[PDB]
Every structure is written in structure tokens, then in C-alpha cells.
Amino acid sequence: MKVILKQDVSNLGKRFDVVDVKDGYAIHFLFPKKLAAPLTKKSLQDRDLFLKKQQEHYEINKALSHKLKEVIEQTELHFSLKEHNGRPYGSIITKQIINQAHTKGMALQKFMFKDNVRLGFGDHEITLHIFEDTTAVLKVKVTPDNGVK
Amino acid sequence: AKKDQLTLRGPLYGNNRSHSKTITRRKWNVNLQPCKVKTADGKTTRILVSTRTLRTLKKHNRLS
Amino acid sequence: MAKLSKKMKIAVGLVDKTKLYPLQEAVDLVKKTSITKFNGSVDIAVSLNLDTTKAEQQLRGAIAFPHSVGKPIRILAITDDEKAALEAGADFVGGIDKINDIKNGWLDFDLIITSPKFMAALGKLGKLLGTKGLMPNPKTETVTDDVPAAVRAYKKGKKEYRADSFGNIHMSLGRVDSASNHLVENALALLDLIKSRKPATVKGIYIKNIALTTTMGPSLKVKLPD
RNA sequence: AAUAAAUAGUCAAUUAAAGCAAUACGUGGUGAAGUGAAACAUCUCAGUAGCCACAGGAAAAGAAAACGAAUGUGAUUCCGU
RNA sequence: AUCAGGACAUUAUCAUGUAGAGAAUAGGUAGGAGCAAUCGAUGCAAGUUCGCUAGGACUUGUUGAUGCGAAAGGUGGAAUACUACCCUUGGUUGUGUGCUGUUCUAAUUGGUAACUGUUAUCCAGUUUCAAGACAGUGUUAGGUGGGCAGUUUGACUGGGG
RNA sequence: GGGGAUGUAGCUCAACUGAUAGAGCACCUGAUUUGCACUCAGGAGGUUGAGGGUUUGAGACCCUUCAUCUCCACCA
Ligand SMILES: [Mg+2]
Ligand SMILES: [Mg+2]
Ligand SMILES: [Mg+2]
Ligand SMILES: [Mg+2]
Ligand SMILES: [Mg+2]
Ligand SMILES: [Mg+2]
Ligand SMILES: [Mg+2]
Ligand SMILES: [Mg+2]
Ligand SMILES: [Mg+2]
Ligand SMILES: [Mg+2]
Ligand SMILES: [Mg+2]
Ligand SMILES: [Mg+2]
């Protein structure tokens, strides 16, 4: 019968998941380890409600994350040919605020907490790695243009 | 005795029919088995219940 | 698996191997799956629950189709009444002389019809004609005193049926250009005749599978297959 | 108390139960054998005797997931056929 | 509960094949003689499939079209292509079952020890140890079972046996 | 009362699941020793349990029987 596990186990389910196993293995040996409650509040429908809502907020997060990531993978129209000296110093040290002055409005919003670039924000006369992550799972790479104005 | 403690259903006396339909009195005993029923997280008595009552408790989430 | 030809992938893509295709629909589909430039045959394979090792379960006979199968048959008549056989529409007539021609290797005919008197001469040729299937059989009404009427019946589209060693009957119902109703009526007449020809010894399901196919087509598992 | 809590346990107060008989009726559990079948094992005796539990002034049963074959009757109980 | 193994039908996986005859690998038996080619040949070298010990294809290429004589000759019980279908067999995991084989434990068990109720060999609770899905118990079904029970074991007969 | 299987040299057995019956033993002969036995090899010993049915092809596949066996059943 269907049983919900509240934390993660190696097989079956990962944290909040549902597995349809026989009465079998634990039951009175599952309750003590309370690793898989029969349902949430033991109610088939109530567990439905709870797990559904939780993973639903989770996948609406999934949706906004995908939006950000793909609008980036498809557009990435963030251009900065910032004047570069050459022999004298020249780099992408334009932090990111000037760089985000081209993200919202002209392109995807590209939330502030979503571009997890490091403290360098580019430091060469050449394009470097731009790290933007919509969530902790989606990995976004941006390599925008650079040059001398 | 061979009886439930939650309900009172007990043994059934009957006939032992064989070839030639010879009659000998026999007794069917209930499948008495030991179980522990929690009650408000306490008094986990080791009661002796039948398998049918065990199934009823199991489908009732151990409620009695 | 051998790579299917380009045309057949299309033709196989038109056929659900799992669906139970109703007769009429199968015939209309069978006509559509003909990929050939020549006028193919429409053929039926009926798998029976027969042990053809059992003489009582050996199914052999003839069926007269309501409609012509559209294959011209050259008939050799071996009879004393050569004139009436010719008027019946035999393509070749003769007595012992044609038996000698057959002995010398002349085989430009598709069916032999004969009178009972000639089996002793033809029996000596059983190795040549029997391996080719040209040997007349009483069970097929190819051995008869009225050779002209039988000749007319075969020209009208009478065909022999025989169970193979596996208990299958294979017959050609018509051409691809033949009207679909004619093929359906021909198929029904065969199936009803087969049903009517049940050996008393065959227990259970008699027809295991019915398959319609063309000369160059996939088999379109007739309704209620396998 | 084991053992923090809590139960088990201990104590106190209040309320009921015990038993009897009517050599008779009710319900339930358990339940033979003599005997007959001209033997006997199926069967009968007989769910009788006996044993036990619970009553009551009666008890039990009781308002159709029914009878049953029809333009049908419409809780249970008891008598005749 | 987990792990491993085969066993099973077998998911999924391709090879593999000669009565003779007929150059023919003919595994068979159906419709009936074609049908593929830069998705690329033929001839050869390098591997391998394989016993009919012949033959079979393939890939490792060259190569660039042939055809192809199993398209079309050919004999053969059986025949030619190609649509077939079934394949012979094994090939690997395999599917979901049971089958013996381990490990772990919470079920459960204890006539191990300890504490408590408790001034108490029982019982109950909590442990600890030892087992352990075994055992025990319930239902069902075989085997043995004068230990026990209910009965039978004829009539004629110069008495009966 | 069915269900299955078996029947092949005299004996013990392969069965040559149709493209035309073989092995050990029994027996004859030959070699073989001073003798016996042993030893080796040829030959002989087959109408495939019987009958019927099919095809071009069956002891071999099918039907019918015969004998044998193992199972079950086996309350007139
Ligand atoms: Mg009795
Ligand atoms: Mg009696
Ligand atoms: Mg009596
Ligand atoms: Mg009352
Ligand atoms: Mg004791
Ligand atoms: Mg057990
Ligand atoms: Mg028993
Ligand atoms: Mg006895
Ligand atoms: Mg006795
Ligand atoms: Mg008696
Ligand atoms: Mg007497
Ligand atoms: Mg006397």
C-alpha cells in the first residue's frame, strides 16, 4: 500500500516522496523508525494535500527558474564593450550593477540573487565565465561580449 | 482459555467427518496471537488477540 | 533483423499488427497495401487446429467461389470425350498421347482433369505430377465421369484447398483490382465452408488465426487473430 | 516503582454484586448411551438425559436486503388444516 | 529486510543451418519470380561466423558498379528472386515467480542474569543475554499409530469342533 | 473406467521422428597354445508387436487393436 516517507532513504523515495510498497517490511517496524508515516496525519487525502502543495510551490519555483535560465540561454543580450586600455589596465571590473543596468527591461529580469558570480566579475581584456543560477539545481553560463568602446 | 480479550468470540465445537462419514466431536480454536496496542503513548499491554482483530486494528491504525 | 525496404516501412506503418481488423476494412486495407506495379493476388492464410498427421483431420477439398479469382487457368482434359471437354472450355484435350507428352516433359498446363479409366497411366507419372501438385484427386472432384461439367466449374473459379503439414490453409481469393465486396464474399464462402468441414475429432477452437496478405504485402491479421 | 515524566502499584470514600428456591416453565454452552434398523458401522435414539451459565414473572422472537407467482400477502407469537 | 546463485517461462539481445541431386547451406513451408546500390559494389589482403566439413555470410578496408545466374539458367520429393512466415539452436542480460545459501533484526520466544511492584522461588513491568523470522500456536492436507474406542467373525450338521 | 509410455538379431538394447536397420552378448568360421581357457577379427543371426490411413517420402508420423508397465480413480 501507498506510504509516504518524511525523510530520505537510499531506495524507494527521497525526502518527501510516496512509495507503494506491500504491508511487508516494517509497518509496526516502520512506525517506530517513523521514517515513513502511512500518510500525513495518516489521512490519504490530507497527505495528498500537504505533499502536493509543498512540491507545487517547489515546481512553481521550477517554472520561474526555467524562465530565467532559458531567457538567458536564448537571449543573453548583455553587451558591454567597456573602454579597454590594452597595454594599460582594462577588464570587466564593472562589478555587476552596471552589468544589470542592461538586464531588466531590455531582457530577462535576471534576479539579483540568481547570478552567483564570484568577487571578480570578470578581470581580463577578454570574455570570462559568468555564473548565474536560477535555483540551486539549474546551472546557467553566460559569456557576453567585451571590447573597447 | 482460547478466547479474545477485546471481543469474546471463542471456539467452535463440531463434527470430524471422515470417509464413511463417521462422526467424532472436534473443536476449532481461534488463531490467538500476542500483540501490543499503544493507547495515548502508554500502557502497551501485551494482549492476545485473533488475526481478524489484528487486521481490524491494522486497518484502524491500531484503534481500540 | 534485416532492414525493411523503404516502401515496406510505409506499408508496415499503415498496419497495426495488434488491432483486430474487421474483414471489410482488412480487404480495403489489403488493396491499399499493394505496392506492386503488377496486379498482385489477395491471399488468405487460415491457421487451423488440425493435426494433419491424422487422416480424419486431413482437410482437403474444393470450393466454388461466387466470383472469379482473376487468374486464368490452363486446363488439360484427359477424357474419351475430347469434343465435349473442348466445348466445356478445356485448353488442352487428349488421351494416352497427352500422357506420353507429359512423360516427355510437356507441362504447359495448370490443372489436370481426367476420367477414372486413365489413373493407371497417370499413376506411373505420380513422381513428376505429384511433386508439382498436378495429380487429380477424387477429394477435389478432379476425378469424375462428367469431365465437361467439372471443367466448367474450374473455369467458373472452383479451386482446391488443402491443409499444409501445420494445419494451415493457403488460398488466393482474387486480384488487388477485384471489387472489395467480391473479395469479402469469397472470404466468407471459404470461412463458412471451413467451419462446415469440422472433423468430429477436433476439440476446442478450430480457427487459430486468419491472415490476409498480398503477394508483396504485410499480413493484415484478420479480426480476432492469434 | 524500576526511570525524568508517566503508568503499574498502594490507600481512602461512595455505589452494586454475591446466596437461596417452584422435584415447574425460558435462553445459551456442552452433550451421550441403553434401544431400533430383527447383526452393524450410515441412520435412529437425540440435540433427549445429564453438566454448566443467566434470568424473568413469563422468557424467547419480532417490523422484510420477506414470502412467493399473482391486477397477490404485508412484524413476531400460538391453534386447526 | 538485504545480498548471491542458478532454475523457470522468458522479456530485450543477433548470429546460427546441404538427404543425396541440383555449382547451390534448400533450416523448413507459404504469396509469388526480382530487387539493392556515396546510406554505395564486384576481385583481393585482415578478422570472425561454421560443419553437409562443404558451405554460409558478415566486417577490416581498398573500390566504385555492378547487376544478379538462387531475379531471369540449374536440378531437385522438396527452388530459386523478393513479400513471406515460421525459423534450428544458442547468445547476453533478462522478466516475475517460487528453490535451496548467507547476513541484519523489531515481530516473536526463553525453565540466563539484574532491578522494581515486594519482607514475594509465582506473576507483571523495565532491561541484559541467547535465539530469531526460525520457533510456537491456529486452519488445512498426507504418513505412522490395538495407545484407545465401536463392531463383525454364516448356516446345514444323527451334540459341538 | 481412463491417461501416458514401451514393444527392434535368439538375449540385452541403439531406435536410422521419411528421404531406404545398427552395437554388445548367444552361435559359425578363421587365427590362436604342449593342453585348457584367455585373446583378436570376419561371417551369420532383423520381415522392425500386428493391422489400417496419408504423402513422392513413416519400424520412424497417425488410427485401431494385442501384450507390458506406472499412475490415478475404484460407496452397485
Ligand atoms: Mg452415533
Ligand atoms: Mg448405537
Ligand atoms: Mg440393532
Ligand atoms: Mg423479550
Ligand atoms: Mg516454570
Ligand atoms: Mg513460524
Ligand atoms: Mg491427520
Ligand atoms: Mg486398528
Ligand atoms: Mg478392540
Ligand atoms: Mg451398539
Ligand atoms: Mg450350528
Ligand atoms: Mg458332529
PDB file of N, CA and C (backbone and C1' of nucleotides) in Angstrom, chain C residues 51 53-55 58 126 130-131 162, chain F residues 53-58 61-63:
ATOM      1  N   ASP C  51      -4.469 -31.593 -36.734  1.00  0.00           N
ATOM      2  CA  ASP C  51      -3.320 -32.488 -36.774  1.00  0.00           C
ATOM      3  C   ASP C  51      -3.392 -33.218 -38.112  1.00  0.00           C
ATOM      4  N   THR C  53      -1.459 -35.007 -39.527  1.00  0.00           N
ATOM      5  CA  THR C  53      -0.974 -36.374 -39.428  1.00  0.00           C
ATOM      6  C   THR C  53      -2.140 -37.340 -39.265  1.00  0.00           C
ATOM      7  N   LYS C  54      -3.268 -36.853 -38.747  1.00  0.00           N
ATOM      8  CA  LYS C  54      -4.472 -37.655 -38.574  1.00  0.00           C
ATOM      9  C   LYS C  54      -5.294 -37.613 -39.857  1.00  0.00           C
ATOM     10  N   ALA C  55      -5.538 -38.792 -40.446  1.00  0.00           N
ATOM     11  CA  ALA C  55      -6.297 -38.854 -41.693  1.00  0.00           C
ATOM     12  C   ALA C  55      -7.674 -38.214 -41.573  1.00  0.00           C
ATOM     13  N   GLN C  58      -7.170 -34.517 -41.812  1.00  0.00           N
ATOM     14  CA  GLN C  58      -6.624 -34.009 -43.062  1.00  0.00           C
ATOM     15  C   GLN C  58      -7.766 -33.320 -43.790  1.00  0.00           C
ATOM     16  N   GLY C 126       3.174 -40.404 -61.220  1.00  0.00           N
ATOM     17  CA  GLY C 126       2.946 -39.773 -59.927  1.00  0.00           C
ATOM     18  C   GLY C 126       4.146 -39.052 -59.342  1.00  0.00           C
ATOM     19  N   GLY C 130       2.879 -35.405 -59.142  1.00  0.00           N
ATOM     20  CA  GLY C 130       2.544 -35.282 -57.732  1.00  0.00           C
ATOM     21  C   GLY C 130       3.403 -34.264 -57.005  1.00  0.00           C
ATOM     22  N   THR C 131       4.692 -34.214 -57.336  1.00  0.00           N
ATOM     23  CA  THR C 131       5.583 -33.238 -56.717  1.00  0.00           C
ATOM     24  C   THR C 131       5.219 -31.821 -57.135  1.00  0.00           C
ATOM     25  N   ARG C 162      -6.222 -27.307 -49.464  1.00  0.00           N
ATOM     26  CA  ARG C 162      -5.514 -28.354 -48.746  1.00  0.00           C
ATOM     27  C   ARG C 162      -4.870 -27.748 -47.508  1.00  0.00           C
TER      28      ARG C 162
ATOM     29  P     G F  53      -5.474 -48.952 -45.956  1.00  0.00           P
ATOM     30  O5'   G F  53      -5.419 -47.551 -45.204  1.00  0.00           O
ATOM     31  C5'   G F  53      -6.601 -46.786 -45.014  1.00  0.00           C
ATOM     32  C4'   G F  53      -6.278 -45.391 -44.550  1.00  0.00           C
ATOM     33  C3'   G F  53      -5.276 -44.635 -45.406  1.00  0.00           C
ATOM     34  O3'   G F  53      -5.882 -44.026 -46.534  1.00  0.00           O
ATOM     35  C1'   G F  53      -4.682 -44.442 -43.122  1.00  0.00           C
ATOM     36  P     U F  54      -5.002 -43.661 -47.829  1.00  0.00           P
ATOM     37  O5'   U F  54      -4.070 -42.460 -47.360  1.00  0.00           O
ATOM     38  C5'   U F  54      -4.617 -41.179 -47.080  1.00  0.00           C
ATOM     39  C4'   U F  54      -3.537 -40.179 -46.757  1.00  0.00           C
ATOM     40  C3'   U F  54      -2.414 -40.083 -47.773  1.00  0.00           C
ATOM     41  O3'   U F  54      -2.766 -39.319 -48.912  1.00  0.00           O
ATOM     42  C1'   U F  54      -1.509 -40.144 -45.593  1.00  0.00           C
ATOM     43  P     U F  55      -2.492 -39.906 -50.383  1.00  0.00           P
ATOM     44  O5'   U F  55      -1.189 -39.133 -50.864  1.00  0.00           O
ATOM     45  C5'   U F  55      -1.083 -37.725 -50.731  1.00  0.00           C
ATOM     46  C4'   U F  55       0.323 -37.320 -50.375  1.00  0.00           C
ATOM     47  C3'   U F  55       1.410 -37.907 -51.257  1.00  0.00           C
ATOM     48  O3'   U F  55       1.578 -37.208 -52.476  1.00  0.00           O
ATOM     49  C1'   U F  55       2.014 -38.153 -48.987  1.00  0.00           C
ATOM     50  P     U F  56       1.803 -38.029 -53.840  1.00  0.00           P
ATOM     51  O5'   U F  56       3.119 -38.879 -53.557  1.00  0.00           O
ATOM     52  C5'   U F  56       3.545 -39.898 -54.448  1.00  0.00           C
ATOM     53  C4'   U F  56       5.026 -40.150 -54.326  1.00  0.00           C
ATOM     54  C3'   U F  56       5.543 -40.313 -52.896  1.00  0.00           C
ATOM     55  O3'   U F  56       5.564 -41.672 -52.487  1.00  0.00           O
ATOM     56  C1'   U F  56       6.720 -38.567 -53.939  1.00  0.00           C
ATOM     57  P     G F  57       4.939 -42.112 -51.071  1.00  0.00           P
ATOM     58  O5'   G F  57       6.161 -42.051 -50.050  1.00  0.00           O
ATOM     59  C5'   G F  57       7.372 -42.746 -50.304  1.00  0.00           C
ATOM     60  C4'   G F  57       8.503 -42.182 -49.482  1.00  0.00           C
ATOM     61  C3'   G F  57       8.207 -41.992 -47.996  1.00  0.00           C
ATOM     62  O3'   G F  57       8.542 -43.136 -47.233  1.00  0.00           O
ATOM     63  C1'   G F  57       8.929 -39.950 -48.889  1.00  0.00           C
ATOM     64  P     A F  58       7.427 -44.233 -46.869  1.00  0.00           P
ATOM     65  O5'   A F  58       7.429 -44.259 -45.277  1.00  0.00           O
ATOM     66  C5'   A F  58       8.646 -44.183 -44.548  1.00  0.00           C
ATOM     67  C4'   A F  58       8.397 -44.234 -43.062  1.00  0.00           C
ATOM     68  C3'   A F  58       7.371 -45.267 -42.620  1.00  0.00           C
ATOM     69  O3'   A F  58       7.986 -46.526 -42.400  1.00  0.00           O
ATOM     70  C1'   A F  58       6.891 -43.163 -41.622  1.00  0.00           C
ATOM     71  P     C F  61       7.356 -41.623 -34.462  1.00  0.00           P
ATOM     72  O5'   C F  61       6.223 -40.848 -35.263  1.00  0.00           O
ATOM     73  C5'   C F  61       6.244 -39.437 -35.399  1.00  0.00           C
ATOM     74  C4'   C F  61       5.077 -38.977 -36.230  1.00  0.00           C
ATOM     75  C3'   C F  61       3.739 -39.585 -35.858  1.00  0.00           C
ATOM     76  O3'   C F  61       3.103 -38.961 -34.765  1.00  0.00           O
ATOM     77  C1'   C F  61       4.024 -39.706 -38.195  1.00  0.00           C
ATOM     78  P     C F  62       2.162 -39.839 -33.807  1.00  0.00           P
ATOM     79  O5'   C F  62       0.851 -40.042 -34.684  1.00  0.00           O
ATOM     80  C5'   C F  62      -0.070 -38.988 -34.887  1.00  0.00           C
ATOM     81  C4'   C F  62      -1.226 -39.432 -35.742  1.00  0.00           C
ATOM     82  C3'   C F  62      -2.039 -40.602 -35.216  1.00  0.00           C
ATOM     83  O3'   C F  62      -2.996 -40.195 -34.252  1.00  0.00           O
ATOM     84  C1'   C F  62      -1.479 -41.018 -37.461  1.00  0.00           C
ATOM     85  P     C F  63      -3.416 -41.179 -33.053  1.00  0.00           P
ATOM     86  O5'   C F  63      -4.375 -42.220 -33.781  1.00  0.00           O
ATOM     87  C5'   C F  63      -5.658 -41.786 -34.206  1.00  0.00           C
ATOM     88  C4'   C F  63      -6.439 -42.872 -34.897  1.00  0.00           C
ATOM     89  C3'   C F  63      -6.639 -44.154 -34.111  1.00  0.00           C
ATOM     90  O3'   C F  63      -7.728 -44.069 -33.207  1.00  0.00           O
ATOM     91  C1'   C F  63      -5.871 -44.680 -36.274  1.00  0.00           C
TER      92        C F  63
END
